[PDB]
Amino acid sequence: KIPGLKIDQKIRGQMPERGWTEDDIKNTVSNGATGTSFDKRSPKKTPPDYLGRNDPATVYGSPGKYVVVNDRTGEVTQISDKTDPGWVDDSRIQWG
Numbered sequence: 001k002i003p004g005l006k007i008d009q010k011i012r013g014q015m016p017e018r019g020w021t022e023d024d025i026k027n028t029v030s031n032g033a034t035g036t037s038f039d040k041r042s043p044k045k046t047p048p049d050y051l052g053r054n055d056p057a058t059v060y061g062s063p064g065k066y067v068v069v070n071d072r073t074g075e076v077t078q079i080s081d082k083t084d085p086g087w088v089d090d091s092r093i094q095w096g
Contacts (some may be wrong), residue, residue: 001029001058001069001074002026002029002030004074005025005029005069005074005075005076006074006076007022007025007075007076008046008047008048008075008076009047010047011076011078014079017081017083018079018080018081018082018083019083020079020082025076025079028060028061028065028067029060029069031061033058033059033096034059034062034066034095035058035066035093035094035095035096036056036058036059036093036096037056037057037068037077037090037093038055038056038057038092039053039054039055039056039057039068039070039073039077040052040053040054040092053075053077055070055071055072056072057070057071057092058071059093059095061080063095064084064085064089065080065082066079066093067079067080078090
C-alpha cells in the first residue's frame with residue numbers, strides 16, 4: 001500500500017500543521033496495520049472528483065498519532081493532529 005498512497009492537496013496542506021512529513025506518513029504505514037475504519041468523507045473533501053467516499057479503510061499508527069487509508073483508492077483519508085494532545089480519534093476507527 002505504500003506505492004499506492006495518494007495524498008491530496010487538502011492533506012498536503014495539513015501535514016506541517018499536524019506534524020506529519022511525507023516520510024513520517026510512510027514510516028507509520030510501514031509499521032503495519034493497527035486497526036480498521038471507514039472512509040465516509042463528504043464531497044467537498046474528496047478531490048479531484050469531489051463525489052464523496054464510502055469505503056472500508058485501514059488504520060496505521062496509534063490513538064492521536066495515526067494515518068487512515070482508503071482500501072479501494074489508496075488515498076490518505078486522514079492524518080491526526082499530533083500537535084494536539086486533546087485529539088479525539090475519528091468515530092469510525094476500530095483499534096485492533
